[PDB]
Amino acid sequence: XXXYXXXXXXXXXXXXXXXXXXXXXXXXXXXXXXXXXXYXXXXXXXXXXXXX
Amino acid sequence: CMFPKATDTSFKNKLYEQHLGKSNNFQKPKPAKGKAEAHFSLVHYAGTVDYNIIGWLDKNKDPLNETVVGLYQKSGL
Amino acid sequence: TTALVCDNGSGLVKAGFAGDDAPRAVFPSIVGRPRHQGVMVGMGQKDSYVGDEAQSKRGILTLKYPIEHGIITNWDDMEKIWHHTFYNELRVAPEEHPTLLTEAPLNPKANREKMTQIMFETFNVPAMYVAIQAVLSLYASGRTTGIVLDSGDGVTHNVPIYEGYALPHAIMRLDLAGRDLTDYLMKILTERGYSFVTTAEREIVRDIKEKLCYVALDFENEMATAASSSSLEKSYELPDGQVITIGNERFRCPETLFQPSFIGMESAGIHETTYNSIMKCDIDIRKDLYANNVMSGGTTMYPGIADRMQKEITALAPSTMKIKIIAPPERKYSVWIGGSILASLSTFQQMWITKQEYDEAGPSIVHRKCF
Amino acid sequence: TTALVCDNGSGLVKAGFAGDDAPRAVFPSIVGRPRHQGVMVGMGQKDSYVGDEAQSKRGILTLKYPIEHGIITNWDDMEKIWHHTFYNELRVAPEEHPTLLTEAPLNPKANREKMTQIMFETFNVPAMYVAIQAVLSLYASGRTTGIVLDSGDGVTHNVPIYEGYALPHAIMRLDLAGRDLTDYLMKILTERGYSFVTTAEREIVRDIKEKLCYVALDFENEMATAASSSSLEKSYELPDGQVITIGNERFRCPETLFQPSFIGMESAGIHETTYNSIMKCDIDIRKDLYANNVMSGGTTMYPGIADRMQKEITALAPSTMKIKIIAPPERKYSVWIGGSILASLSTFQQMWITKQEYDEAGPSIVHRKCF
Amino acid sequence: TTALVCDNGSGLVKAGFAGDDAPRAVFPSIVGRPRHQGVMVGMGQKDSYVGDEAQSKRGILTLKYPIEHGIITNWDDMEKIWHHTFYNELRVAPEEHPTLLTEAPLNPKANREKMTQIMFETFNVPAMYVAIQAVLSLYASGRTTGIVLDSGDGVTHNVPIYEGYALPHAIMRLDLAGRDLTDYLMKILTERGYSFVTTAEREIVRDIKEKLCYVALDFENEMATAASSSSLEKSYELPDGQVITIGNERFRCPETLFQPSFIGMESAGIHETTYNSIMKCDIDIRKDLYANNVMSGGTTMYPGIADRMQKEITALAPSTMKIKIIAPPERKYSVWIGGSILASLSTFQQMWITKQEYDEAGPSIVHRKCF
């Protein structure tokens, strides 16, 4: 095994990754959904500014 | 229909996303008389005709078993 | 044709034609959306969910709450809710009826202007009205004078109404409603330290608020009983999962109304606010109000409030004069019921807004035309 | 045209078109090579052998096993296997269908990237997808929510799935699969001390794992019966050669799942892992999962697992609430069956990878695009 | 005589007399026990092990972790730890000093009551106190007003303190501490798929958390650099064995604090929690806190947190007004240091609990007497 497994696994699993994760897209969407202070206070400032 | 244990309403909603905006000649049926619910409205060479849903999806479902005829093949008849 | 009323008093939302005894059905005004990657490809993705549908679906949904402090937070969400309610429950088209709107008093014009703007434009609806809670409360309770306390899901009220007129100076308006109390509850609950914070987890408390609460008769004496006894303590299940068993933590909660230290503010409380607001109002009327004292909705549901209230007034009143309070059974529905009555009388035909005005003048129309 | 799915869930390997009830045939993913000088000059020398061909040929061949711990060990060997499978069983050309790939969840990107890279380049194939086991398990079992346990040839799983979504934090993933258990078996077996170690000798055990195993109902009580009785003990032949007869050594084996001391690790076991992972997940959902509990594949084949599992949950659950588990007949096939369903729905036409993307962007595409 | 303070802020545990600059030594509060048959008969069997002794001995020991979520899990284990600490490091007898206890705020009474009960009974100790972290944090940082963030081994905090007073309603308390983050790390790490799960293996990560982490300045931009460069990637050894080399997997970790999706929860994060909790608190004070902003301990060690925090506040603040944060060097020690100061002032002689009260009334004494 020390030859057989390691020849592949040491060599290739060296370089594992690159992506702009779709899971991070999920995170971004969620944080947008759950920036309460952003949505609510923007909406309230926008409306409440107009007084007639 | 292989999505199980769920309701034609689900597809209703999938209609409403999928076609109801997109597909011009198909329509949400207007109100009309004679019927509790009608769900589809589309346009035909005969003119334009409108039709309705009971949950029946499974009726088209085809089960199979080898076994049934498999053994009947043994049988006397 | 026929006439239809929306209740948008917060909490579950109430809608029904004039002359039915009770609204057809009622919805929390929860709004909620997905939290996780959608991984059944078979599933249709719907990105927003509301009502008992959501109440079932909750767990991966997460909640937004479109009314803070009686102020409705995000309009388009409301529009979603509203559309759903009409079509799904009501099977109703905007043309079909005049529609009547239910408002916190003394709150920013914007809710008036956008609400009307949307509902005349987005919906197109024969006649519109927005009405202040207390008026309905009187009509249902049927005493032309009065003072009302109704602390719903949302901002909590004192209005004296005299027969046929408003005293808008008299009026007191408070953000003390049960939701914020409930969120204080958790800061209690960690004492026993079964502990969870998220929106749905917070609504789970609502059930306990139904079941487990009752009003302190006397605070000191209750503490003495708390030292003596466990009958004060009752055993309750998770909606699913564990049995949970709760001490003084039940009764301590309502006292916040009497003492909003526990989440800390100064306004000297329901009762002292009330007597204050009385002492603002003039001298002769007062006896009537001492007689006519009226309460409703979300907090009032608790057993016993009226009694300690009376104890408080007997503290503050000159004992010499009669005192009583009204505690009807139906208080939580009261508003929409009164709205039905309000809908009934032909005078609103004189009174409704019509599309024509909305054509010829803006949202500005309302603020003259309505209270 | 038509659409084709490979199962590379480890153990024998399963492949079949959408809509067939069961894959055409199935192969271990053994790989093996010669061990001795080739001394029939008449023989053609082939230097690598796979599949039932090898399963016959084994004795002078020696095995390599191209998937450890669900991680596929040596790519070019896989390519040999894969090529063979297409041409020899399937009589299929890479252009012919979209092809669907079956993955351990939560495991290193590399398997994704090279798998796709090879199969788009080395094979040239209209559309590609890689899918997580549990999704298929639900689709076949047809309950949109659930939790799955499937401990195959390879790394052993807990995933709760709620309807339409993933909880990737919730998930637990374990290298406890039956192969390593079997290799522990030998360290048992030397007690009776009929003893042999090599790969083929190890696979011989697999038959015994088919035939001779059954699940301990209660460990102490079983030991008491072990002292009492020999009905616990059964007599079995070498595949050729001797009769062999086996005591508690049969039932002791599965307990490792409950107690991975015997080859020693800490993760508190299948069931405690499951309840742990539950208690991670949120409060309200839980009842459904208490209802909907689902198991499949290699280990589950054993008679009785579900029962002691239920015993365990009745230990750990508050007894108050309903509990049951599902134990379908077909579990070992379940995955590929679900894959067939997965293949069926047109939405993957929206969803497949196409060659074009692989042209225009790398393997990186997958990790956004797929789960 | 002289006065002695235990820190039981979780992680390594800190203890020292009043007026020393830094505690004498410090211990993880790991607890661990044997895993294997003891097979050197020459060895003395000790069945439980703690502290750097265990940290050496670990491999056959297996860990228990006596504090979850800042809540101390198993009392008798604590008692073992505590006894050891006194006698082995401190060479101290319970009579010798008043002793001061260090508490997560807003957490279940039980920790108070048993802690005091044990330490007055099991140890017999002149004077006792339990104190809330933020108070010490101010005293050490020496600004009488403030807000503190300190996310230790254990549950993670927001408290505004104004000069001389508490705002217990204001306060936010979160289970987001670095341990759970670290356990998420593994679910990261399997991407590169060098993979190991057990307690000691988990603590090995702690070193990497020391060495390899740094704070994302901007997430998108960092991803762009991640596509560009490998300087983002650094090479690190096993504590023994291999060299390991780590990409974005380092910086991605702290973002969880800003986005607790990655192990998924809703509380909108450190910074949004903070500004929320501000907007709870009243209007005029706010500028001071905009000025006085203070952070400490386990997570804060990371380079750069304060900067992105300031970026976040500049997002959320009206830019018009001054903003800064404090990031002292010594934060991880800060608490015990402040405790030393707390010990110094004679007023606790007015303030300590004495044995006499514990005689004359129960643990109940504390909850009136202390915060």
Ligand SMILES: Nc1ncnc2c1ncn2[C@@H]1O[C@H](COP(=O)(O)OP(=O)(O)O)[C@@H](O)[C@H]1O
């Ligand atoms: N069974 C119950 N017992 C006590 N309180 C309840 C019960 N059911 C609902 N509530 C509370 O009553 C309120 C319902 O909303 P509502 O009173 O209609 O508010 P609004 O006055 O804004 O319309 C909420 O605060 C809800 O938590």
Ligand SMILES: Nc1ncnc2c1ncn2[C@@H]1O[C@H](COP(=O)(O)OP(=O)(O)O)[C@@H](O)[C@H]1O
């Ligand atoms: N008759 C049987 N009884 C019990 N276990 C079996 C039987 N046949 C195969 N197995 C085991 O089931 C597994 C077959 O592989 P599989 O379950 O498909 O793994 P994977 O989940 O990786 O696809 C192997 O562990 C094999 O030893």
Ligand SMILES: Nc1ncnc2c1ncn2[C@@H]1O[C@H](COP(=O)(O)OP(=O)(O)O)[C@@H](O)[C@H]1O
């Ligand atoms: N060099 C370091 N770099 C970053 N974090 C560290 C370092 N050393 C320890 N930590 C973390 O700091 C915390 C130490 O415990 P502590 O901060 O005292 O928690 P508590 O606030 O409960 O006392 C743990 O989360 C530990 O992993």
